[PDB]
């Protein structure tokens, strides 16, 4: 996260770290959506251009964390993966269209002050909140700058951007399964996700029921926090039918 701040304790209790077993290192962000299911970006698990194709046994998820590098004894919980599910139409070849994946845990994680699931949006909450100018919140342990790493989880609030502005900011083909967020050059404020934040949640707090909803997944960007560029996020609601199908079939 670039130009963000340290998270407060328990501020993002659905935050998940995807952790490589060997060598031991951060792979991505992710989010807890139930006691057995974790949501992330498909490119965190499968990205052939970079020779990335992880299997269940390659990975762990670490839940309840604040410190990036510490083993947070008595606070974090570490879970093994039962199965990875990647969207069948995930487009790793071109533009990361449908950049979404689910991971089922081998055993349920115990909820605590530091571990708690985020909501997934319904159609109405999505229609109400996914509007240009409305702000969401992105969290992660990724890079602090494009070209180091944070001691603890970082957070930044960013406004959703008008679709034509998103489109005009890049040569990459944008789809309805993406939205973009970030400040414009003329807005004076800054901030963005960066490498390492991939797969983490873009969340919004509904003013109707005071619950947090995950509207986006950190997907892609050209550089980090560049003027005139924006971060792009997987549109969770647009892909919710797939999410439900997987959970209904394999839950």
């Amino acid at each position: 996260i670039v130009e963000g701040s340290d998270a407060e304790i328990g501020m993002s209790p659905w935050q998940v770290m995807l952790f490589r077993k060997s060598p031991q290192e951060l792979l991505c962000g992710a989010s807890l959506i139930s006691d057995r299911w974790v949501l992330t970006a498909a490119h965190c698990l499968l990205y052939p251009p970079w020779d990335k194709n992880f299997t269940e046994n390659d990975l762990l998820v670490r839940i309840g964390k604040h410190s990036r590098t510490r083993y947070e004894r008595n606070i974090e919980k570490i879970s093994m993966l039962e199965k990875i599910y990647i969207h069948p139409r995930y487009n790793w070849r071109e533009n990361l269209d449908r950049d979404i994946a689910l991971m089922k845990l081998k055993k349920p994680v115990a909820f605590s002050d530091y571990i708690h699931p985020v909501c997934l949006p319904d159609r109405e909450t999505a229609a109400s909140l996914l509007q240009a100018g409305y702000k969401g919140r992105v969290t992660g342990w990724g890079n602090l700058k494009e070209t180091g790493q944070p001691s603890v989880l970082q957070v930044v609030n960013l406004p959703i951007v008008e679709r034509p502005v998103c489109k005009d900011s890049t040569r990459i083909r944008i789809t309805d399964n993406m939205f973009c967020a970030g400040y414009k050059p003329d807005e004076g404020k800054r901030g963005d996700a960066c490498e390492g934040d991939s797969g983490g949640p873009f969340v919004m707090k509904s003013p109707f029921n005071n619950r947090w909803y995950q509207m986006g997944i950190v997907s892609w960007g050209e550089g980090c926090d560049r003027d005139g560029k924006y971060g792009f996020y997987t549109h969770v609601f647009r892909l919710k039918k797939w999410i439900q199908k997987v959970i209904d079939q394999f839950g």
Binding site: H116, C119, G136, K205
Partner: peptide, 28 residues
């Protein structure tokens, strides 16, 4: 979950975090 999106250390205790008001103010 019935309890999704309500944080133990914030919503469950009626405490606000330092910047959530920025989000609310944007929901015009």
């Amino acid at each position: 979950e019935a309890d999704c999106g309500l944080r133990p250390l914030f919503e469950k205790k009626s405490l606000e975090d330092k910047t959530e008001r920025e989000l609310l103010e944007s929901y015009i």
